[PDB]
Copies of this chain bind each other. A is one copy, B any other.
Amino acid sequence: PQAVVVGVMAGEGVQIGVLLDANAPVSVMTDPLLKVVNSRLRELGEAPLEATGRGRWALCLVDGAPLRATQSLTEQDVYDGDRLWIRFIADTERRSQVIEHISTAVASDLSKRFARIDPIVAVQVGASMVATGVVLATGVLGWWRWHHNTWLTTIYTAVIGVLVLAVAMLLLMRAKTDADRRVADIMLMSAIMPVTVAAAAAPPGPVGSPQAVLGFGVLTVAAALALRFTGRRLGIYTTIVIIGALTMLAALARMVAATSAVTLLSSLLLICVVAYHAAPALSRRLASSVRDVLLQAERARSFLSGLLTGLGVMVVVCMTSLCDPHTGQRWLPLILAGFTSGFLLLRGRSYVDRWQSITLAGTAVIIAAAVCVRYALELSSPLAVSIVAAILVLLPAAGMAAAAH
């Protein structure tokens, strides 16, 4: 217990293993320690550490935060096998500055601490406004087809899709910087929506099973094709491919033959259940020498975050459609929802990533809450709403309490 071995980082990156005195105060070691790292760098043939003007030498954690100069190395939470960094921190002493006349003083200070609008942000805002605009136009065009059978909806939407896509295509070839690419990506992201309803609107007669199949098909193809050719925005495109593909299969079955929705809903739940287990493997297969490691790591992380999210959307939509307050053995889907919630709650903590673990944890809470709301709006009564409210408020309160206590 008299000494601890730790790695010390020095100038430009040399890590050196050292056996330090565990109880002397850290300020006693930084001077001779600087001499030692310099001696080794000199023999290695490298350039030694040097001061610049006014400042001091300190020993810090890898995070840069300095250790308290008067405390012992054992007094701080430093253990054998950890690492530290020796660093130069410059002098902050300078004159103070004063402006008395109030109007000038407000203008001066307020301009140094905040950011003004610029031409770069103006274009990103413009792109965002047009994307929002076209989804509103397709919405009203779709709302017309859902009550009318004329060619108008497909003819009108097709030209919009082609025009937006033509602009995005021309922008992608010319983009030079990430600022330019974000503008183009927003434009491209919006092109998928009109083409989807444009195709689904083509088959005549009343809307339903046969029309739905085309939309989810072209949606799945377009999202996948955009990803393949662009190689950016993995998350948003991947999530669409999952929900699109799974919906296409269900739509095809219902169009051909299906005894009940419960059958399809149960099938989807089962498909997602196995997919949650296979999720990391799917991501691993879907995903000068050092670069090869860095690129692959974030790629897999991207695909996995979207995958886990898309499955969440399917099960919440499916489970809320499976449970009911009046049909048959009312308790059966409720306990099934409970078991489903427990699995997601337990398995969500195994993933070593904040957004993946957080997104999975949140997915369970919304499923539970949706069932409670269903059991309050339908089968309505004063006791029922009172009971649901108590359950609905205490459930998340208890979840927080388990972590806070």
Contact = CB atoms under 8 A, between A and B. Distances in A.
A7 to B, nearest CB: 11
B82 A62 contact: no
Contacts of A83: 28, 31-32
> Which of the listed residues A21, A29, A63 has the most CB atoms from chain B within 10 Å of its own CB?
A63
B18 A36 contact: no
Q: Is the interface of A mostly helix, strand, loop or mixed?
A: mixed
A206 interface: no
A19 interface: yes
Interface string A73-106: 0000100001100000000000000000000000
A36 B19 contact: no
A20 interface: yes
Contact of A20 (B36, B39, B62, B77): B62
Contacts of A31: 83
A32 B64 contact: no
A33 interface: yes
A3 interface: yes
23 contacts: A3-B64, A16-B63, A18-B63, A18-B64, A19-B63, A19-B64, A20-B62, A20-B63, A20-B64, A21-B62, A28-B83, A31-B83, A32-B61, A32-B62, A32-B82, A32-B83, A33-B62, A33-B63, A36-B61, A36-B62, A36-B63, A36-B65, A39-B77
